[PDB]
Ligand binder design. Structure first.
Ligand SMILES: NC(=O)c1ccc[n+]([C@@H]2O[C@H](COP(=O)([O-])OP(=O)(O)OC[C@H]3O[C@@H](n4cnc5c(N)ncnc54)[C@H](OP(=O)(O)O)[C@@H]3O)[C@@H](O)[C@H]2O)c1
Ligand SMILES: CCc1nc(N)nc(N)c1C#CCc1cccc(-c2cncnc2)c1
Length: 165
């Protein structure tokens, strides 16, 4: 299965100047817990924002150009990225906007962190129809000394039905 994991501020904001316009350590733990020992697929710009491999996970970067870091696996297409993941139960797509756009139609699961911050972005999470998705998990947290905004984790599963001809 293909899953997307993303943190979204107000108005689907996910990025600004190749960074995330917030600081939420609590989201880091949620992200690790849900990606641990799973392959992670990311766009080149997201890779550049990280700057080093994510420990515990098979790192796959999509780029039209040669790779600039031998520690991760570089691919040049969506099908290639999926091919590189091999025979695993869950592929985690971790960003950014362009990559989310391409994978959302193929995904069966969304792991979302809703952040209560009204902040400007230049990158947004792709639009999707809420009627295609079923929320199966919520977990709310107030802001604290380490996290300046309240946030809520959510998991959604894609709605299926019987194929008819
Ligand atoms: N809030 C969150 O959960 C979250 C998570 C991750 C990232 N972000 C944010 O999102 C922003 C970056 O997103 P972005 O949309 O600018 O870039 P991106 O998706 O991270 O990377 C886009 C790049 O990936 C490569 N690529 C994507 N699809 C390809 C394809 N089908 N075939 C070949 N290459 C492909 C291309 O690289 P080449 O130019 O080399 O061809 C393209 O320029 C940053 O602000 C980042 O901080 C947010
Ligand atoms: C942790 C940020 C995050 N949260 C959620 N819920 N979904 C995501 N896809 C992401 C992300 C991301 C890309 C990214 C960009 C910059 C740094 C890191 C990072 C991840 N884990 C440890 N250190 C840095 C990760």
């Amino acid at each position: 299965m293909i899953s997307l994991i993303a943190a979204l501020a107000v108005d689907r904001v996910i990025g600004m100047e190749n960074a995330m316009p917030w600081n939420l350590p609590a989201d880091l733990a949620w992200f690790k817990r849900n990606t641990l020992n799973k392959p992670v697929v990311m766009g080149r710009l997201t890779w550049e924002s990280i700057g080093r491999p994510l420990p515990g996970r098979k790192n796959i970067v999509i780029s039209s150009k040669p790779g600039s870091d031998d520690r991760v696996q570089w691919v040049s297409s969506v099908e290639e990225a999926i091919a590189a993941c091999g025979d695993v139960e869950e592929i985690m797509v971790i960003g950014g906007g362009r990559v989310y756009e391409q994978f959302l139609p193929k995904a069966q699961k969304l792991y979302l962190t809703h952040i209560d911050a009204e902040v400007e972005g230049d990158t947004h999470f792709p639009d999707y129809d809420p009627d295609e998705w079923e929320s199966v998990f919520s977990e709310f947290h107030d802001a604290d000394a380490q996290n300046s905004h309240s946030y809520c984790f959510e998991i959604l599963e894609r709605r299926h039905h019987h194929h008819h001809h």
